[PDB]
């Protein structure tokens, strides 16, 4: 009746406008702003190019042939569209695992992944993803032809169908695709996003807190007191000796860097300084009693103070140290907000105090909460992508094993909506990008 074609036109016209406005927008904002072109966004640019390739070059040749019940277009485009329809899904699935491998190496093992987060590596894997996708999907332009059929009163009409030599070669192809495009990309992404969620659940630690409160400066730089410090708050010497700062530095490390310590050299010295700060608390008869009775969040704050001030300096906070042992947290915060350490470094002192008062990492839960926001978005686009393309790949396997029953039950309206679900996947990714930053303000 008239209702099925009418809803097919307004649905396809809307998803065409949505996928052509967003994907054109995201390729612009990335090609305009070099600040946005991170390693993760480079893959998302490739993912957005394939979604536009599938919407512009393929989505029309799927609706208007169905609405006409005839493939009026030539036989060379039946081979071209099916070629691009297959290449688009292959690069999109395998770019979605590239970001999962990228986020795994950047979070779970940030030490041995330096060969991955380089921009030249991402360019050669999106080149390999696009190149091999065109090579893997070569059977589609080869075994796609026009199948003649009669409609009404000897009305000759053609249809574009994918036909292989035998049924064995047909069911071994759709099994190969379900295996290489959904099953294998599925388990490697659950172990990737699962291991990532394990690290992000570990929360903020003391080494990340001190790395935030101090930062990394490779050259010898003046601290708040004026003395030369290097690395992550490693004091060289309090005596005004510019030569002793170079000698004491080269005495610890294994060469005369003349103030040019590598990034891995500063981490070895930063790990040693924390051990010297926690063992200074254990030997102190005033800091050890309060350290053993504090929470893991509050214990890290006490070591943060020893890292900055020293064992003898913080041990003089006898009024605040007893207040911490008295578990009266809000009162210890007011007593600590009146010291010299709070006025010498107000920003650093406010963070360490709020961890004492609340016992939470909320003062440093910023970059961790931003990393949690990106992973939650990447998990949604993967679930939405699989939810859209599973009905068509599973129905193609049913058609390869039982062609009579599969075509009989779903060939009119059911397959018309199954394909419509697979085409919505091209526009849902730009919609999620918007809904992340203040798009929820609109109404």
């Amino acid at each position: 009746k008239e209702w099925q074609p009418a809803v097919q036109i307004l649905l396809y016209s809307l998803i065409f406008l949505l996928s052509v406005l967003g994907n054109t927008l995201v390729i612009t904002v990335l090609i305009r702003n070099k600040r946005m072109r991170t390693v993760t966004n480079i893959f998302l640019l490739s993912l957005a190019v394939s979604d536009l390739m599938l919407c512009l070059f393929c989505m029309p040749f799927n609706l208007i042939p169905n609405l006409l019940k005839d493939f009026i277009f030539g036989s060379a485009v039946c081979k071209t569209t099916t070629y691009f329809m297959g290449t688009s899904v292959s690069v999109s699935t395998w770019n979605l695992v590239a970001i999962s491998l990228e986020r795994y190496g950047a979070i779970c093992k940030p030490l041995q992944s330096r060969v991955w987060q380089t921009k030249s590596h991402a360019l050669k894997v999106i080149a390999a993803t696009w190149c091999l996708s065109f090579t893997i999907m070569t059977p589609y332009p080869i075994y796609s032809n026009l199948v003649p059929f009669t409609k009404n009163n000897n009305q000759t009409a053609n249809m574009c169908r994918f036909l292989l030599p035998n049924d064995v070669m047909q069911q071994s192809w759709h099994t190969f695709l379900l295996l290489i495009l959904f099953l294998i990309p599925g388990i490697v992404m659950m172990v990737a996003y699962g291991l990532i969620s394990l690290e992000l659940y570990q929360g903020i630690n003391i080494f990340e807190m001190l790395r935030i409160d101090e930062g990394l400066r490779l050259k010898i730089y003046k601290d708040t007191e004026g003395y030369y410090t290097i690395g992550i708050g490693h004091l060289l010497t309090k005596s005004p000796s510019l030569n002793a700062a170079k000698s004491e530095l080269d005495k610890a490390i294994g060469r005369n860097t003349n103030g040019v310590i590598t990034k891995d050299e500063a981490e070895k010295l930063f790990n040693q300084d924390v051990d010297a700060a926690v063992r200074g608390i254990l030997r102190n008869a005033k800091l050890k009693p309060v350290y053993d009775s504090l929470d893991a969040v509050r214990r890290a704050a006490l070591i943060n103070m020893v890292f900055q001030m020293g064992e003898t300096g913080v041990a003089g906070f006898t009024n605040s140290l007893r207040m911490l042992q008295q578990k009266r947290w809000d009162e210890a915060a007011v007593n600590l907000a009146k010291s010299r350490w709070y006025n010498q470094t107000p920003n650093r002192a406010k963070r360490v105090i709020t961890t004492f008062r609340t016992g939470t990492w909320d003062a440093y839960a910023a970059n961790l909460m931003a990393k949690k926001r990106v992973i939650r978005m990447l998990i949604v686009i993967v679930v939405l992508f699989f939810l859209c393309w599973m009905p068509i790949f599973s129905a193609n396997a049913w058609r390869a094993y039982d062609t009579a029953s599969a075509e009989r039950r779903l060939s009119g309206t059911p397959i018309s909506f199954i394909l419509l679900l697979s085409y919505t996947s091209s526009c849902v990714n730009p919609i999620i990008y918007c809904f992340m930053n203040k798009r929820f303000r609109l109404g």
Binding site: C58, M85, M159, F162
Partner: peptide, 8 residues
């Protein structure tokens, strides 16, 4: 009687 469907 369109029966079946275009590949993808």
């Amino acid at each position: 009687d369109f029966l079946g469907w275009l590949x993808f």
